[PDB]
Amino acid sequence: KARGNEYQPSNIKRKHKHGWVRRLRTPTGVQVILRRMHKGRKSLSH
Amino acid sequence: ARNVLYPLYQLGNPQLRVFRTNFFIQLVRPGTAQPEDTVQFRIPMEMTRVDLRNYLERIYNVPVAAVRTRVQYGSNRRRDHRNIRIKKPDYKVAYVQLALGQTFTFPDLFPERKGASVDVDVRDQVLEDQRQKHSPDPRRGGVPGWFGL
Amino acid sequence: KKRFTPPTYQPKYK
Amino acid sequence: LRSRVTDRYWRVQEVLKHARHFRGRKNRCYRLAVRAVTRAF
Amino acid sequence: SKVTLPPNYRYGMSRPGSLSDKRKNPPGTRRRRVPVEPISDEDWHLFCGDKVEILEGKDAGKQGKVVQVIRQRNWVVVEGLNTHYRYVGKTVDYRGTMIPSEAPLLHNQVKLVDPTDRKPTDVEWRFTEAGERVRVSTRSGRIIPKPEFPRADGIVPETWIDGPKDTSVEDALEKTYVPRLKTLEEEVMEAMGIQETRRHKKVYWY
Amino acid sequence: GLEEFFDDPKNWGEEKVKSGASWTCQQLRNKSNEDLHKLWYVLLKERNMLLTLEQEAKRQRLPMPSPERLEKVVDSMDALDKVVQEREDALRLLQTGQEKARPGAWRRDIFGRIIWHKFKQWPIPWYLNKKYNRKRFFAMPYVERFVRMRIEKQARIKARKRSLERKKEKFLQEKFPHL
Amino acid sequence: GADRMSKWTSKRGPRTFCKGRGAKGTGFHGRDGKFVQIKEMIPELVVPELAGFKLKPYVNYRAPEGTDTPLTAKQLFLETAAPAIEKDFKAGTFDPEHLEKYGFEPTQEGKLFQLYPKNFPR
Amino acid sequence: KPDKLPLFKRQYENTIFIGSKTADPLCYGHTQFHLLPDKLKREKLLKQNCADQIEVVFRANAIASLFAWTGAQAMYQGFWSEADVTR
Amino acid sequence: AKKGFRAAYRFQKELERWRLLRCPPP
Amino acid sequence: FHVRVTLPPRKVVDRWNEKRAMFGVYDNIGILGNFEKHPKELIKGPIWLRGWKGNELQRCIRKKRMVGNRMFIDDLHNLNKRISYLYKHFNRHGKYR
RNA sequence: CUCGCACACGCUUACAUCAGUAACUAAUAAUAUACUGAUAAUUAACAACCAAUAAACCAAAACAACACUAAAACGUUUAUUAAUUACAUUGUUAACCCAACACAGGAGUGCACCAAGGAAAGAUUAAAAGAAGUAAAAGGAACUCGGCAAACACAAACCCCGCCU
RNA sequence: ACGAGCUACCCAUGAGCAGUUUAAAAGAACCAACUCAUCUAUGUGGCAAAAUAGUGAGAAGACUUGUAGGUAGAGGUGAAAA
RNA sequence: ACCAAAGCUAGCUCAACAUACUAAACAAAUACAAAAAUACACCAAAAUAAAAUAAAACAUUCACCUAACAUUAAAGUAUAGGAGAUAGAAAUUUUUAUCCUGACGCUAUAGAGAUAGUACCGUAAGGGAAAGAUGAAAGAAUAAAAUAAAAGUAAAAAAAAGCAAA
Ligand SMILES: [K+]
Ligand SMILES: [K+]
Ligand SMILES: [K+]
Ligand SMILES: [K+]
Ligand SMILES: [K+]
Ligand SMILES: [Mg+2]
Ligand SMILES: [Mg+2]
Ligand SMILES: [Mg+2]
Ligand SMILES: [Mg+2]
Ligand SMILES: [Mg+2]
Ligand SMILES: [Mg+2]
Ligand SMILES: [Mg+2]
Ligand SMILES: [Mg+2]
Ligand SMILES: [Mg+2]
Ligand SMILES: [Mg+2]
Ligand SMILES: [Mg+2]
Ligand SMILES: [Mg+2]
Ligand SMILES: [Mg+2]
Ligand SMILES: [Mg+2]
Ligand SMILES: [Mg+2]
Ligand SMILES: [Mg+2]
Ligand SMILES: [Mg+2]
Ligand SMILES: [Mg+2]
Ligand SMILES: [Mg+2]
Ligand SMILES: [Mg+2]
Ligand SMILES: [Mg+2]
Ligand SMILES: [Mg+2]
Ligand SMILES: [Mg+2]
Ligand SMILES: [Mg+2]
Ligand SMILES: [Mg+2]
Ligand SMILES: [Mg+2]
Ligand SMILES: [Mg+2]
Ligand SMILES: [Mg+2]
Ligand SMILES: [Mg+2]
Ligand SMILES: [Mg+2]
Ligand SMILES: [Mg+2]
Ligand SMILES: [Mg+2]
Ligand SMILES: [Mg+2]
Ligand SMILES: [Mg+2]
Ligand SMILES: [Mg+2]
Ligand SMILES: [Mg+2]
Ligand SMILES: [Mg+2]
Ligand SMILES: [Mg+2]
Ligand SMILES: [Mg+2]
Ligand SMILES: [Mg+2]
Ligand SMILES: [Mg+2]
Ligand SMILES: [Mg+2]
Ligand SMILES: [Mg+2]
Ligand SMILES: [Mg+2]
Ligand SMILES: [Mg+2]
């Protein structure tokens, strides 16, 4: 009833949803890594 | 050794031998109260308890009894001029205890010299005297004193 | 409808 | 060839020199001076 | 230890890792790039320790010894000729020890002086029949020797006393290498009598 | 034997301590392999003592006496490591002729790059490894477009660099017309 | 949120996540879960005797340097194996088939310390 | 500090026990038998370069174990810090 | 930095006027 | 409107350098050379603009025809969007029609 | 005046010792758990990591004696194997986390309600208006859309629409 | 392309419900922890981009709750409020 | 008199030439929850691009829009089109090499977003900045030179009456 705190931290969830391993398991995920490497991002993924 | 590739071990392999160790050890003064037999070392991350026990017993011939180690975390809070965190390196601290009742106390590595202390006092006294001489005479009222008349 | 415009935040570097 | 106006200082001085004796913000601000100067003439 | 510098930097007769340099140039600042004419390392004929003559400045025609050279900005610093005065000892209630300080000079205002005639003369590098690179004058045509100068360490190898942890010259130059086809691992193992019987199994690399 | 971490007591309070020069590369090539093994530990005991003194200097908020000793010792360590490595690779070339002591092969990863893949030690072959068979060494067709874009990005960076060098040369000539 | 531009180490995750800081394993898990530490896998440091050894970590300043000549695989062969081969060929005892007497080894797996696999760490 | 023994702080239920609850009529003890574990064998101590530690383990076990038993007996009889011990 | 010289020089005519007003010449 | 307070260093331009003295020397090569080379064979510049002239639309179309296959990916996309916008603006917009 | 100690999850040195605060941080001052500089620290017994196959076995947890309907988490033994070899690696600070904030909000479990943890008022004057609390002559819904709110009241009955939780 | 760390529903694995009334652990009853949010007053750039104070409904079940997994926009999910 | 003002470098843009095209760094660790030496595997895949728009609506249609091998002409011709909007060839022709490459392109609200894809805002894909100025020497800071010119204030509050001026 008081929104604003939708982010409840969790390392297990964060590394399973946005982790480096998951990014390389789907063909669409690899394209996300390729786009961020081309743009020059400091951190490709979590 | 660190930054090297160890041989994979299977059944019946020969003993693993390292001839030129890549490790380096700092002996540091404990920051808190420690018992009489405890000596505190700073060791690289790739060093285990068994490596340190062999490191001291063989290279330095120190009869250690028990070795306990922990990992320290450096501060990553202070920001650079461009607002980028600068992280101090993490170091591994290991405490050893001597076996044969040997007692170790950390020595005072910077004992001051009485002659040097006296010389510093004389140098400070000379500077204070020089400042007193350079101090203007209040009765002159700011008039320069270099000219004779 | 439920008309509502959320506020925006000034950039922190300012 | 990027052309920029450099004599803009004299552009506004030709207007403010006729509005030096006004009262308020009309003697300083250019936008308020022109409407006052034009009505003055 | 080597200190990294920003791509654009200004040199002011102070070493990069000094507190004076940090006070002058904070890490968060960067200034205008001065125009420096490129001189290749093979075209820099001015070293430290050789007498040179100053052409332009408050003093003209005087000769002095070069003490410091700034290669980055093409500077040669004479020993107390083009001097300006500053204060060193500063405190709340006392100032003193007025010490003259020498300002930098460019290469175009300094010409090398030949030993014989003691006059400024243009110098060009020449390759002689002995294989050594020796500077050669233009007018007089005489070669000028290199200006041997003491190193920054301040230690002269001629007068030295070996300390407790110093190796003698005889042992340093003593040769004991017997070039056989055994690695350092093999030689030490057989030197101390370390005996190993079993052998490693097969290990797959991929 | 725990006093080896500290210098001799006569030298604790000395503000400046003199030391000899570091070992040069040529001097260590004349020493035997047995000699280098013994010299490594003489350097090793020296380096531990210097590190202890340096840390103690920070604790006491006083400068380290003659800090250039540590720089000399680490230079001697690197030279000793170099010369033994010069003997290992030279002996390897005679016996086997391989340039690198760790096996490897050039592979194309999923990102399209060329990566020198070092090999690892395993007790089972490549086809019986669960983890290894999950890594992929090849580029999918959608990587072709992204590989092409990296070439364009590097080409523009080099093109900008080359034009910058030309501009400086013209700029310096005008202010230095000595030609 | 969380910092994605920092080092992911064992101290950040839950109790389940325990990642080593780079040490080399020295054993495995036994029957009862007690860690069985293999004696062989422990790196046995080998040290010589420095008591009768006269050498110091520093060299005298007056000692001259030398021309920096990196060791070459060709120079090593001319120093060690060439004199033996040259004498044998002049005496007619050279055998092209077998070169094991000159220090050449056909297969590395026979010896204790291989070269191409790089068996020994250091 | 005791942390250098080492000793580690922990928080759980504070229990005073004699081997049986208070309702048991056998509130006193006669003897104790203790068996040293595998980690504290004489052979293990010798390998760890520990000579005088052989007697230390025996003494440390007896002092801590017997005090807990004798202390628990006193507190089952009502004696505590402010009542001290009569017998 | 706007390119040109007329603007730079015309202001020097103004700077002289201000100096005379502040410090009139004898 | 603040103007600079210091006189800039006057540009000493020499009217008789190599470029200005020899400027436009061989402009009449065709007239006085038995008509062997048209004066359009002296223009230095882009490949697609040597001896050609046009508006913005015809220039972008011409660039795509000649050097289109040699352009970069990003530049090839930006040129296509420029052609489409100019095509729509020139034909479907304006006053005189 | 009373949400206190600890673990899990999260944050990541913000914790500790010494010194400085003209200014930066605290919505003020003193000052320093919160700002700056130097030095130092969390030591395993607790916690993470911590065997495979074949076979016998229909019979609930609720003080479980024995039962109910909604039919229920929770394994031992025999056999064949399992590198046997002191000391492995890793988490141990905090006044903290998610909400733009040093936010009256959101936050799981164990044990206490205290032996522990904290400060409603920066200094005055005692105007109107506004918010919160207590008391009242005679009358007791005459107020008002409605007994809304408040109350020394804390009860009784009818109707409409839905059966009920 | 990326999103079920909030929310709707579900699959795993765990953890809570003290006293009181009754042959009852009966989608019974009184009342806390706990979970929802009826009525009114403050608040309306506020302590809060939905809160505080008083008062209320359930409180052994179609109940609350932690960890983690599943369903993704021509769809998911829904004791239909589009 | 404060606040302010001024500077000319950093670098960039468009080409040309051009090698022939994923740079620099790879000692160790990197697709277990990346940067954690070490165990019986599974591994992998393709299906025409659509629409915003134009026809003043909108259903057939709507250039470029992935893959053309160019230039001068044939030609906006033959043809294809609710024969409307608009779409549009070919047969057949023309093209002499290398140097002469630099700038009637910008100068810190311009030029690339860039001092940088870094701070910072987002769970994630993603979005994405502002910021530099002394001199030959600051190893000349009792340090020096320069405009004292934007709005806003101070020096100096106001005295009947009014689009504030004439
Ligand atoms: K038109
Ligand atoms: K924190
Ligand atoms: K009514
Ligand atoms: K999920
Ligand atoms: K709040
Ligand atoms: Mg949010
Ligand atoms: Mg949640
Ligand atoms: Mg530990
Ligand atoms: Mg973030
Ligand atoms: Mg953890
Ligand atoms: Mg934790
Ligand atoms: Mg064990
Ligand atoms: Mg935070
Ligand atoms: Mg405060
Ligand atoms: Mg203090
Ligand atoms: Mg602090
Ligand atoms: Mg606030
Ligand atoms: Mg208060
Ligand atoms: Mg107050
Ligand atoms: Mg009032
Ligand atoms: Mg009342
Ligand atoms: Mg009354
Ligand atoms: Mg009424
Ligand atoms: Mg009425
Ligand atoms: Mg009503
Ligand atoms: Mg009411
Ligand atoms: Mg009715
Ligand atoms: Mg109902
Ligand atoms: Mg009914
Ligand atoms: Mg969920
Ligand atoms: Mg109950
Ligand atoms: Mg009920
Ligand atoms: Mg409430
Ligand atoms: Mg209330
Ligand atoms: Mg009330
Ligand atoms: Mg109720
Ligand atoms: Mg009810
Ligand atoms: Mg998905
Ligand atoms: Mg639907
Ligand atoms: Mg529902
Ligand atoms: Mg309906
Ligand atoms: Mg409806
Ligand atoms: Mg239309
Ligand atoms: Mg229209
Ligand atoms: Mg289309
Ligand atoms: Mg037809
Ligand atoms: Mg810019
Ligand atoms: Mg501008
Ligand atoms: Mg002003
Ligand atoms: Mg009037």
mmCIF file of N, CA, C and O in Angstrom, chain G residues 50-80:
data_model
loop_
_atom_site.group_PDB
_atom_site.id
_atom_site.type_symbol
_atom_site.label_atom_id
_atom_site.label_comp_id
_atom_site.label_asym_id
_atom_site.label_seq_id
_atom_site.Cartn_x
_atom_site.Cartn_y
_atom_site.Cartn_z
ATOM 1 N N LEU G 50 72.928 -22.263 3.476
ATOM 2 C CA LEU G 50 73.553 -20.968 3.249
ATOM 3 C C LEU G 50 74.643 -20.646 4.261
ATOM 4 O O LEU G 50 75.203 -19.546 4.215
ATOM 5 N N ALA G 51 74.952 -21.567 5.175
ATOM 6 C CA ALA G 51 75.969 -21.294 6.185
ATOM 7 C C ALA G 51 77.358 -21.211 5.562
ATOM 8 O O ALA G 51 78.121 -20.280 5.845
ATOM 9 N N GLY G 52 77.699 -22.171 4.707
ATOM 10 C CA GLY G 52 79.006 -22.199 4.080
ATOM 11 C C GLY G 52 79.021 -21.547 2.714
ATOM 12 O O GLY G 52 79.926 -21.787 1.910
ATOM 13 N N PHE G 53 78.018 -20.719 2.441
ATOM 14 C CA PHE G 53 77.847 -20.074 1.146
ATOM 15 C C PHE G 53 78.135 -18.586 1.293
ATOM 16 O O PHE G 53 77.493 -17.903 2.098
ATOM 17 N N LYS G 54 79.091 -18.089 0.512
ATOM 18 C CA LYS G 54 79.553 -16.705 0.605
ATOM 19 C C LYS G 54 79.041 -15.926 -0.603
ATOM 20 O O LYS G 54 79.637 -15.968 -1.683
ATOM 21 N N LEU G 55 77.937 -15.211 -0.411
ATOM 22 C CA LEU G 55 77.373 -14.343 -1.436
ATOM 23 C C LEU G 55 76.363 -13.423 -0.769
ATOM 24 O O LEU G 55 75.720 -13.803 0.214
ATOM 25 N N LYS G 56 76.232 -12.218 -1.308
ATOM 26 C CA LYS G 56 75.435 -11.184 -0.669
ATOM 27 C C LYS G 56 74.399 -10.640 -1.639
ATOM 28 O O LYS G 56 74.587 -10.706 -2.858
ATOM 29 N N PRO G 57 73.291 -10.097 -1.124
ATOM 30 C CA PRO G 57 72.247 -9.567 -2.016
ATOM 31 C C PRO G 57 72.656 -8.320 -2.784
ATOM 32 O O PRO G 57 71.904 -7.893 -3.668
ATOM 33 N N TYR G 58 73.806 -7.721 -2.480
ATOM 34 C CA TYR G 58 74.256 -6.517 -3.160
ATOM 35 C C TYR G 58 75.650 -6.736 -3.728
ATOM 36 O O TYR G 58 76.447 -7.506 -3.184
ATOM 37 N N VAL G 59 75.936 -6.049 -4.830
ATOM 38 C CA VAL G 59 77.221 -6.143 -5.511
ATOM 39 C C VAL G 59 77.954 -4.818 -5.358
ATOM 40 O O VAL G 59 77.336 -3.753 -5.243
ATOM 41 N N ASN G 60 79.284 -4.890 -5.351
ATOM 42 C CA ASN G 60 80.104 -3.696 -5.191
ATOM 43 C C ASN G 60 79.870 -2.725 -6.343
ATOM 44 O O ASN G 60 79.649 -3.129 -7.487
ATOM 45 N N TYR G 61 79.920 -1.427 -6.028
ATOM 46 C CA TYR G 61 79.688 -0.405 -7.042
ATOM 47 C C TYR G 61 80.795 -0.375 -8.087
ATOM 48 O O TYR G 61 80.530 -0.077 -9.257
ATOM 49 N N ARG G 62 82.033 -0.672 -7.692
ATOM 50 C CA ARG G 62 83.153 -0.605 -8.621
ATOM 51 C C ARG G 62 83.212 -1.788 -9.577
ATOM 52 O O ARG G 62 83.993 -1.749 -10.533
ATOM 53 N N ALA G 63 82.420 -2.827 -9.348
ATOM 54 C CA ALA G 63 82.438 -3.991 -10.227
ATOM 55 C C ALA G 63 81.875 -3.616 -11.591
ATOM 56 O O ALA G 63 80.742 -3.122 -11.669
ATOM 57 N N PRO G 64 82.614 -3.820 -12.677
ATOM 58 C CA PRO G 64 82.119 -3.408 -13.993
ATOM 59 C C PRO G 64 80.968 -4.283 -14.462
ATOM 60 O O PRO G 64 80.836 -5.446 -14.072
ATOM 61 N N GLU G 65 80.130 -3.703 -15.314
ATOM 62 C CA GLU G 65 79.032 -4.437 -15.927
ATOM 63 C C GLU G 65 79.569 -5.229 -17.117
ATOM 64 O O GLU G 65 80.778 -5.314 -17.348
ATOM 65 N N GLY G 66 78.665 -5.823 -17.893
ATOM 66 C CA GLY G 66 79.056 -6.546 -19.083
ATOM 67 C C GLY G 66 78.076 -6.287 -20.208
ATOM 68 O O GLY G 66 76.955 -5.819 -19.994
ATOM 69 N N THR G 67 78.525 -6.596 -21.422
ATOM 70 C CA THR G 67 77.666 -6.457 -22.590
ATOM 71 C C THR G 67 76.482 -7.407 -22.477
ATOM 72 O O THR G 67 76.660 -8.625 -22.378
ATOM 73 N N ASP G 68 75.275 -6.849 -22.493
ATOM 74 C CA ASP G 68 74.061 -7.636 -22.287
ATOM 75 C C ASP G 68 73.852 -8.544 -23.489
ATOM 76 O O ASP G 68 73.409 -8.101 -24.552
ATOM 77 N N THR G 69 74.172 -9.824 -23.325
ATOM 78 C CA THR G 69 74.002 -10.823 -24.378
ATOM 79 C C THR G 69 73.016 -11.880 -23.907
ATOM 80 O O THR G 69 73.400 -12.797 -23.159
ATOM 81 N N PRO G 70 71.745 -11.794 -24.296
ATOM 82 C CA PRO G 70 70.786 -12.829 -23.898
ATOM 83 C C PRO G 70 71.203 -14.192 -24.425
ATOM 84 O O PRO G 70 71.703 -14.319 -25.545
ATOM 85 N N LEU G 71 70.998 -15.215 -23.602
ATOM 86 C CA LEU G 71 71.355 -16.568 -23.999
ATOM 87 C C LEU G 71 70.496 -17.016 -25.173
ATOM 88 O O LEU G 71 69.279 -16.814 -25.187
ATOM 89 N N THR G 72 71.139 -17.623 -26.162
ATOM 90 C CA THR G 72 70.475 -18.068 -27.375
ATOM 91 C C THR G 72 70.559 -19.585 -27.472
ATOM 92 O O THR G 72 71.553 -20.194 -27.062
ATOM 93 N N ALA G 73 69.498 -20.193 -28.005
ATOM 94 C CA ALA G 73 69.488 -21.640 -28.189
ATOM 95 C C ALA G 73 70.628 -22.097 -29.089
ATOM 96 O O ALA G 73 71.109 -23.227 -28.955
ATOM 97 N N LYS G 74 71.069 -21.239 -30.010
ATOM 98 C CA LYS G 74 72.197 -21.592 -30.865
ATOM 99 C C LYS G 74 73.515 -21.518 -30.103
ATOM 100 O O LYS G 74 74.386 -22.377 -30.278
ATOM 101 N N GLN G 75 73.680 -20.499 -29.254
ATOM 102 C CA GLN G 75 74.914 -20.371 -28.484
ATOM 103 C C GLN G 75 75.066 -21.510 -27.485
ATOM 104 O O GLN G 75 76.181 -21.989 -27.247
ATOM 105 N N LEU G 76 73.960 -21.945 -26.879
ATOM 106 C CA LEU G 76 74.026 -23.055 -25.933
ATOM 107 C C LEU G 76 74.461 -24.341 -26.621
ATOM 108 O O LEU G 76 75.253 -25.113 -26.066
ATOM 109 N N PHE G 77 73.949 -24.594 -27.827
ATOM 110 C CA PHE G 77 74.340 -25.795 -28.559
ATOM 111 C C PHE G 77 75.819 -25.766 -28.919
ATOM 112 O O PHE G 77 76.514 -26.782 -28.799
ATOM 113 N N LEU G 78 76.321 -24.611 -29.367
ATOM 114 C CA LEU G 78 77.731 -24.497 -29.716
ATOM 115 C C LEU G 78 78.640 -24.614 -28.501
ATOM 116 O O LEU G 78 79.829 -24.908 -28.658
ATOM 117 N N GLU G 79 78.112 -24.391 -27.299
ATOM 118 C CA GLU G 79 78.911 -24.440 -26.083
ATOM 119 C C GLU G 79 78.966 -25.836 -25.471
ATOM 120 O O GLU G 79 80.002 -26.234 -24.930
ATOM 121 N N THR G 80 77.871 -26.593 -25.549
ATOM 122 C CA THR G 80 77.760 -27.874 -24.857
ATOM 123 C C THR G 80 77.871 -29.069 -25.799
ATOM 124 O O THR G 80 78.711 -29.949 -25.590
#
